[PDB]
Amino acid sequence: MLKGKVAVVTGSTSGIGLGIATALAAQGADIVLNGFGDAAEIEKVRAGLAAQHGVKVLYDGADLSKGEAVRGLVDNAVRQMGRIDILVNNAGIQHTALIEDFPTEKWDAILALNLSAVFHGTAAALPHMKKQGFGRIINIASAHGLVASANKSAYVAAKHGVVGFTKVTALETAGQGITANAICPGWVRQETAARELLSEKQPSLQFVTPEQLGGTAVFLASDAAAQITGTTVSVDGGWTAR
Amino acid sequence: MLKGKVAVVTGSTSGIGLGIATALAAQGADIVLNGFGDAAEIEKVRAGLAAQHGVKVLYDGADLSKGEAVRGLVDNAVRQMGRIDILVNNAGIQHTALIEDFPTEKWDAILALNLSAVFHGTAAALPHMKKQGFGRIINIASAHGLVASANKSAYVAAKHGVVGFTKVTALETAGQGITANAICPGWVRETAARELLSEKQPSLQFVTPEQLGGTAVFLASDAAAQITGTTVSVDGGWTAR
Amino acid sequence: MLKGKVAVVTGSTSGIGLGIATALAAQGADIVLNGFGDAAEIEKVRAGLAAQHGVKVLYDGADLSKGEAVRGLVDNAVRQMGRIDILVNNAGIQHTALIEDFPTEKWDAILALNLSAVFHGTAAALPHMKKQGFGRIINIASAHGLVASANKSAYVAAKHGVVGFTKVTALETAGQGITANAICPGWVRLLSEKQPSLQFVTPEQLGGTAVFLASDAAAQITGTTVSVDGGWTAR
Amino acid sequence: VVTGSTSGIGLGIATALAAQGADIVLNGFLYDGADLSKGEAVRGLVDNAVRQMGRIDILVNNAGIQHTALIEDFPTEKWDAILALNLSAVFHGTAAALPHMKKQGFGRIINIASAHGLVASANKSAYVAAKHGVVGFTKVTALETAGQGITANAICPGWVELLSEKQPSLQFVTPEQLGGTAVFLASDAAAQITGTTVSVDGGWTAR
Ligand SMILES: NC(=O)c1ccc[n+]([C@@H]2O[C@H](COP(=O)([O-])OP(=O)(O)OC[C@H]3O[C@@H](n4cnc5c(N)ncnc54)[C@H](O)[C@@H]3O)[C@@H](O)[C@H]2O)c1
Ligand SMILES: NC(=O)c1ccc[n+]([C@@H]2O[C@H](COP(=O)([O-])OP(=O)(O)OC[C@H]3O[C@@H](n4cnc5c(N)ncnc54)[C@H](O)[C@@H]3O)[C@@H](O)[C@H]2O)c1
């Protein structure tokens, strides 16, 4: 369990991030949600998680494309929740196109959110975690942080950058009660159609779910994973095995 | 929880294997212990786990150096336990020496146990798991299954082979409710301790059988249904640099 | 030999880049040098290679921290040299500090040059190489593009990013007579902490490696990394 | 010395090394025929090379067989064979070449693994496993010879459209390309290239 602990999950207003925030809340961790979408639906999710799990849940609408806003999210989490034990850097965006046709604006945006926000979040969290003698940085990368796919140059580059940054984070904090790891998901979600689309990269022909990724984050945040650091955990149904 | 499931752990009469068997027993899984040791000591361990965790625990001392003995362990597990949901290939041995001075005897011994045993054990279990529509093969490799160190060629070669074998197992079982992964541990066990770990383990802290047991429990969980054909490094940063 | 071929090497005014530009010139390739340092020395180098190897050697001092400038380097290279067969993205900088103490300005500068310049240069070169039906993109990453070291977050992240970008480049050009690879050097001048051989890597060796990747013997070597680190990544 | 150089890649590498002016010692089924499936023969072919050739500077372990079948149907017979040659031979060959090279103060061990020494494919458990084994063995060899003038590396080839599934380049790799690669690895430019792999797979492992 994670009672008494505080977890900040970027881009948790929906999808994978919400699945992770939910799983952590279910372990008794207080949560700080983040991301965009419909404000009423967001408040419903925030209020609902707090009630369903008996934990404190706040919403911070910080725009992660801005370095200072990312750092502010972490520092405010500490001010309001009293500490920060788990930081899940999850928010990300995508754009497909040949390298020569890839807009510089899109390249910069993907690098800023998918990679630099990991830097800014981590930088702000580390001083608190070191003083706490406890920390868990969980970066949601991708199978594309380990291998490549055509037409996703910026995304692949940024995700590879995250895996490398994660390793450095682990080395700088080794032995200080802090670990840093990167979860690398395969595809996340007519049955014939689905299996056909997954056939290309995902051998299991099964989609990875937000609940499964949430369970993986919960494991990394547990004491059993105290010595799991600077590594990647592939949840890709065999994507990278071949 | 793993109530109603049966887990076979090779080389579990002590150390890491026992740590894994214990964590699995704590989740409610019936256990099949394996390995060598003192009859009384082993029985104390076996009876103790069964009583403490309220599950059935069998002990099979099959010598895993022989391929038929390995498959026999699995068959005997299904025969006596009724099924096999989880197989943890853990048994292993080591021998240090330069390549030109590495006894061929030792080379063949390390490969037979550290690698071929995984093949034999896996072959025997798959038929049952495929029929059940569920299975978890957890191979305990090592950091040396990903990187290397001087004077341990057979060990490193075997461990690498295990990683490769794990991926194939995963590919052949994809989507059939069966996963296969390899846990790659770093140093497993104050100033001296740190000095000894300083060379390979950044954390300067040992990995524990309990932690590896918790890692096996995670891999056997439903949250890990889509984690297959990969490695989980529990090395305190060993492989990050 | 690379007679009739044009190679552009970023950051070739010294160290590794110069070692690679030189090695490629010795193979008959025309060269476009780039980078900073002393102007008089740069001219001596440029004229010296052209005369000593009998090839056209040009100098373009484009500041590669600027995307448009990188694209301009390649386009002007096609204008003045007539073609571009080899693109060696080598230019890079470094900064060391704990992540929490790492200046945002340094993180941005390292990503801009060490990673984004590889994108801009590749983006500009591809249209030409595809039309030509030939191309060789060689990115100089680092052992830090495969593993990490404490206090070098921006550098390690950027190098890893380069390794990944190289893989995508290879896949988008697969089979079009174009290959994209990354050379990952170890230390280049206690060396025992990272490099087992206890021997530094040299610009000459790296140059020789670039020549091979540029040769036809490596026509099917693409989307991979070639470690020249004396055992760094082995352990 | 180039094992399994009686044809295919082994011959391609053998050839390429010839065009460079290095005395060659062929093998398979000077010339030798030692059965590499026997650690006895393998170790012999090496020492027999330094005997009749005067010395050994480049050892290329290329011998290897294949067999496909689900793991549970994979004959223990085949498994042991694929392992015996595809992997154990590299240990025997290398074990017999090190004392010589170390004394010579120079050496180039070139193991011919496969893309299957880095990734895997269904129904090739024994081959994939021995290949990964080669990669690991190659790395240990380097660490034990680091700074002694000897390097150990592994070439991991792809297919040598029916390759659409594994090779995006959709083009086969050739024995000469592999030969040139071997030539390069033997080059003085590869003095610091040790303990690593070189993938020649048209982008196989990149995705
Ligand atoms: N979808 C997949 O199958 C898949 C594959 C593996 C890796 N990934 C990675 O998983 C993570 C989650 O992806 P997802 O599929 O749940 O996506 P999603 O779009 O469902 O969720 C992204 C979240 O990011 C937030 N966000 C975006 N830009 C932001 C900004 N500037 N500031 C603050 N918040 C911002 C959104 O509000 C949203 O809640 C991403 O990092 C992605 O790259 C996803
Ligand atoms: N301890 C470490 O630091 C470390 C590092 C990473 C990897 N490893 C791996 O961890 C695993 C467990 O090692 P450990 O350190 O717990 O050692 P251990 O000696 O404590 O346990 C090994 C077990 O294997 C059993 N065994 C040995 N030969 C056998 C045979 N022929 N048949 C059946 N059982 C046999 C023994 O009876 C024993 O219970 C091994 O696979 C090892 O390679 C250990």
Ligand SMILES: NC(=O)c1ccc[n+]([C@@H]2O[C@H](COP(=O)([O-])OP(=O)(O)OC[C@H]3O[C@@H](n4cnc5c(N)ncnc54)[C@H](O)[C@@H]3O)[C@@H](O)[C@H]2O)c1
């Ligand atoms: N030990 C090592 O030296 C080592 C380790 C492995 C990787 N690396 C990488 O090798 C590559 C070559 O660097 P080096 O070690 O020869 O160092 P160097 O400083 O001698 O060479 C770097 C070159 O980059 C050029 N440069 C810098 N900023 C530029 C800009 N804005 N625009 C255009 N050119 C610019 C310089 O003028 C110089 O010629 C770098 O990418 C570096 O990160 C070096």
Ligand SMILES: [Mg+2]
């Ligand atoms: Mg792959």
Ligand SMILES: [Mg+2]
């Ligand atoms: Mg290492």
